[PDB]
Amino acid sequence: VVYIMSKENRLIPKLSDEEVMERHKKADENMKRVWSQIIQKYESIDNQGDVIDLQTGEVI
Amino acid sequence: ISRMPFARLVKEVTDQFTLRWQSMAIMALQEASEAYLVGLLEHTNLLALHAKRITIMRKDMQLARRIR
Amino acid sequence: DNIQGITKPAIRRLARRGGVKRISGLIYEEVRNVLKTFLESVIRDAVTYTEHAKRKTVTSLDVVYALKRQGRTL
């Protein structure tokens, strides 16, 4: 894992064109996952008015 | 992000389309606004990195933007 | 006001969470710009959904439907 000097003289990892692209891809997989998690949280009946019977596990 | 200026903005923006906001509605918007921005900042950061900079510029953000 | 939905310290927090180490000062205005653009798009969808339902209050389900639309393009 090699490092080189940025134009501001700080050390940054020397990534190939491809590794950089793979980082963009991982950024995207990640923001997709977060987004759907936000949607699932607010969409759930459990934080709309909800009551659950513990015998059945079902929404009353 | 702080809640109060965000809320003031949500209201300014709802007004150009005319309403009241449920509190979970603003929170969900805020959580979503934050993911969106952070995601764009990561892409912007990667463009700077490819140009061998650790300082992100308006031009970097503008490009990450154009790739809608 | 001139703070346009997000304080300068909050913008810096978002950038750090994005892995950024340094920003040009022009990033502040650009991030505020992006925020406004994103909200106009999302809020336009949420609003028409609230009105098509004939309600006066935007619900978390209004925002959710609006987010699903943004989710499928982005």
TrEMBL record, chain A:
The protein's name: KLLA0F05115p
TrEMBL record, chain C:
Location of this chain's protein in the cell: Chromosome; Nucleus
Molecular function GO labels: DNA binding; protein heterodimerization activity; structural constituent of chromatin
Key words of the record: Acetylation, Chromosome, DNA-binding, Methylation, Nucleosome core, Nucleus
Residues annotated as domain CENP-T/Histone H4 histone fold: 12-72
Location (main, coarse): nucleus
GO cellular component: CENP-A containing nucleosome; nucleus
Family note: Belongs to the histone H4 family.
Task of the protein: Core component of nucleosome. Nucleosomes wrap and compact DNA into chromatin, limiting DNA accessibility to the cellular machineries which require DNA as a template. Histones thereby play a central role in transcription regulation, DNA repair, DNA replication and chromosomal stability. DNA accessibility is regulated via a complex set of post-translational modifications of histones, also called histone code, and nucleosome remodeling.
Subunit structure: The nucleosome is a histone octamer containing two molecules each of H2A, H2B, H3 and H4 assembled in one H3-H4 heterotetramer and two H2A-H2B heterodimers. The octamer wraps approximately 147 bp of DNA.
Protein name: Histone H4
Species of provenance: Kluyveromyces lactis (strain ATCC 8585 / CBS 2359 / DSM 70799 / NBRC 1267 / NRRL Y-1140 / WM37) (Yeast)
Stretch of the intact protein here: 25 to 98 of 103
